[PDB]
Symmetry: C4
Subunit: 90 residues, 4 copies
């Protein structure tokens, strides 16, 4: 359970280190520094306006941005569910 959380935080930090680098210069209010990234990736992970509000405007400059966001969503949303179930079982 704590092991699941450990994976998720490593993933969340690596995702935010990558996101800062990729879309930081072009989208500063969303990924203009590691912290700005960690917030936006938490927002993306919750699915609040992930596509219409973030990923589509991102794709208008970086057309393949989907190769990073969609897998990230698939991976982080599975982990969160897995974790939340793990606490409930334990």
């Amino acid at each position: 359970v704590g092991s699941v959380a450990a994976l998720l935080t490593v993933v969340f930090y690596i995702a935010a280190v990558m996101a800062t680098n990729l879309y930081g210069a072009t989208f500063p209010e969303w990924f203009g520094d590691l912290s700005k990234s960690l917030y936006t990736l938490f927002q993306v992970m919750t699915l609040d306006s992930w596509s219409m509000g973030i990923v589509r405007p991102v794709m208008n400059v970086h057309p393949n941005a989907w190769v990073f966001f969609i897998p990230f969503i698939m991976l982080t949303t599975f982990t969160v569910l897995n974790l939340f179930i793990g606490i409930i079982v334990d």
Copy 2:
């Protein structure tokens, strides 16, 4: 489990083949080619602005578009949940 994923990908491809054909010419930014469709249907499956952002504008041109999106939502959202639970069970 892998069988559940196999169903979902077939559904996802058939849904995107259908969606391209139906609302492609009228809504090119959303379904203007199989890939554009696969992205928008993933977005619809996650429920991000499915109605206010996609389905309602689509219905303003195709008033019965709901006969395709609502069942798709019902089917894909059930499958994803069923799949995610299936992995969790098959690990215990």
Copy 3:
């Protein structure tokens, strides 16, 4: 399981018969007829722009509209989850 679905459809029809009557004349594109209502209540049940997009503009004319939408959300979202789990178990 089929019993759960039966409850939900009765609730969904009564909710749409009530919604048509309450906010139909004031918000025709959302509840201007039983079918328009059934669509918007499905949208509300999925939580797509339920508050910012629907319930807040509804409350600007009917300030207590929350006494209908919030319980409806609580009830329908519980039922859907209960149903989806029921199919998975059976």
Copy 4:
């Protein structure tokens, strides 16, 4: 089960007492009184436009507003899921 609901209502009231105080004067339509707060925190708990619609505009005046909303989300969303599962188990 009823104990889980009891925790959530205490949390929900304390969160709305805090939220009223913090962002009430600056964002009156959202937290301008305990009731306005309880509605917006329910909306945040459901995740409807939590960030783009609420938290980001809030952060433009209070840059650390995230220290309150993100933990609240983490805590309330876990509780609701835990509660909904608890009813389902206590019926079997």
